Amino acid sequence: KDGYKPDVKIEYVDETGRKLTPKEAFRQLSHRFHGKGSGKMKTERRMKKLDEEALLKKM
RNA sequence: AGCUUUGCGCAGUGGCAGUAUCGUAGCCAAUGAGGUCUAUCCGAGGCGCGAUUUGCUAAUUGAAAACUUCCCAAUA
Known part of the structure; x- marks a missing residue:
């Protein structure tokens, strides 16, 4: 072979840059594949949880 | 006029809630249900059947856990 030690690193991240849990990454992948995202109430709950x-x- | 009682309902604090809270359309019951104490005495329901409204919020699962067209590229 050519001879190297490729640093194959695979990680799940979001648009906010935070590392995602495997359940969250799978949820994002399923939402993108199904073509439909979460509802307004779920989005509001997620935004409130993130806030x-x-x-x-912060403290 | 001030004060007070019983009963009742509204409102409120506090408390209780499966040996608790009710319906009972079934039956019996002050023309006496049930009594081991006080029995020539007490005085209320008792026994079977069948239950334990409404709103808000949060969390979990799931791709989606339900409120009215969404997406992509570029400039302003």
């Missing part, structure tokens, strides 16, 4: 997490991690 709460950001507030908690």
